[PDB]
Design a binder for this molecule. Sequence first.
Ligand code: HYP
Ligand code: HYP
Ligand code: NA
Ligand code: NA
Lengths: 310, 310
Amino acid sequence: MKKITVIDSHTGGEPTRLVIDGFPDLGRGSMAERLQILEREHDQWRRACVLEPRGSDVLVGALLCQPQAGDACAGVIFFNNSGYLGMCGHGTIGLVRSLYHLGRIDQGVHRIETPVGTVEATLHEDLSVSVRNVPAYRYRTQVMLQLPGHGKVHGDIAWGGNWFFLISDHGQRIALDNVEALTHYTRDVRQALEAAGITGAEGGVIDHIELFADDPQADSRNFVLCPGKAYDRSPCGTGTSAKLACLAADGKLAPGQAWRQASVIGSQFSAHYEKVGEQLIPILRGSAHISAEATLLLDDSDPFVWGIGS
Amino acid sequence: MKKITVIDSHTGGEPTRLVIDGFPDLGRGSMAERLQILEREHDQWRRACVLEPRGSDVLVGALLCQPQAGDACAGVIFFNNSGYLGMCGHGTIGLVRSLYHLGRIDQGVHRIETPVGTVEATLHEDLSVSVRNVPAYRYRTQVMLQLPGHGKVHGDIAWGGNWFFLISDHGQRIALDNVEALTHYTRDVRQALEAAGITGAEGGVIDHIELFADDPQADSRNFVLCPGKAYDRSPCGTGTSAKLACLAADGKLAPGQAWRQASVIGSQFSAHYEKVGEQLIPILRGSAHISAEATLLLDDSDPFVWGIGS
Ligand SMILES: O=C(O)[C@@H]1C[C@@H](O)CN1
Ligand SMILES: O=C(O)[C@@H]1C[C@@H](O)CN1
Ligand code: NA
Ligand code: NA
């Protein structure tokens, strides 16, 4: 009956469902203001779009919006199985590659509005996309955490467009064949954070957990638990952004130096940061590929028209 | 680049991806013969169609085929994240509802060829579908199984279009909020069957495990572990077929008597059986709803064009 028109893509294995038509009107405010309206009045639509049966727990959605600023090519709101994101590095790369597929933009530099500020994406001749993210920073370093299964760990708390807890001394094996244990470990970590009342700046909920390890073919490999407990198949743009701020603050990466980040499934991003005054600006480069052109159909007779689950 | 045209639907929450164009030609043999060719020569296409990133571990695929018999409206081969199915009740309901969506059939009686025999589907005025399945039977009864860490259990081995092990005395709580434990439990059951060399007839691999429990609004509620370790969101057509055979053999359900089966997520099928000779014929009725019209796009520059995973 009701139709939602989408372009599905993935960035290093992590899917983006770009909604290009069919969602409710959210007005003409900022992306942040539109997010509030989307969540308050139309959250069932998020659930229809990305939850089973028409989506999956893994899926991240991106609502295409007309931006406020005249020099912006687009605005976007990102969401997942549990709620709403801030920025989304993999999804921005997906958005830009999808706009190109639609013939709406060409190669070159594009400004994209998001609920956490405007980012600048460059669509290259090889169709990869560089994202100049919002500023990233470390809020707290080596925060101690007691994990009943494993004992103490230390993690950094940092902002890369979403809030992250970053751990290196976890002692877990990071590989696709181990995502079940990795998922349980990171869930135990988030539980420990909540118990100890640990947050980011201004009580920011730390809803992403990332583990880092050495890799024979990159600078690092990671595992990232997302807010709704799915893992990120990509190297995580905002998560890697947070990582750059931590490396920089520890004296381990200077402006302009390349950092290659592999994901739990082996996909890679390249990144570096620039300094503009006091601010650290992460720049991520990766590729998205188109997965499908789809029209979701919302049957009013379907008991699960607005999604399965709690 | 390459395109696969599909109709996505779901039956009681269990998704079916009906491929209506784009797969390789499999010749003009029986559905069983075409299955052999699909698997040996083109298994990468199953993977692109149903695995991440373009699919999901939950997804069951159905390749629409031209049938051999002039009185048949269609042939089908069903597949999932691990390999190939025999019959598929939820998928047959999805197929028939999808054919109606495409305007290719109207209400009435339709014969569908599958790798395990021809089934008869009736599309009703309310758009629900009754499936007269292939004959079902119980092979062995109350087979004792030792479960390390759980206890010992007893199960029936029965054929309902696929091979099932059916357990009542498992002591597990069947509900959507417990699928993690239920998945681990049923995985342990399959491991135990393999350890003991327990099979169906002619060494048939028992690749579906189902647990049954009482339900305040149905005759029973089940949890079904499918061959690739995902659970069936639906009451499971072939699994419920096998259940009818066991109930009949135990003197607990007579021909023509209704049996209401609820799934782990609360969706329901009604079923009964008829007798033709020694043969027990399961008849399942349920509804599918269309989820999406999609064109999957297979980019040759995509490293995961043929799917992620082992
Ligand atoms: O690439 C990113 O930034 C996002 C964050 C995750 O929630 C999903 N991937
Ligand atoms: O309904 C059925 O018969 C099938 C069996 C499972 O593999 C998936 N659903
Ligand atoms: Na390395
Ligand atoms: Na009951």
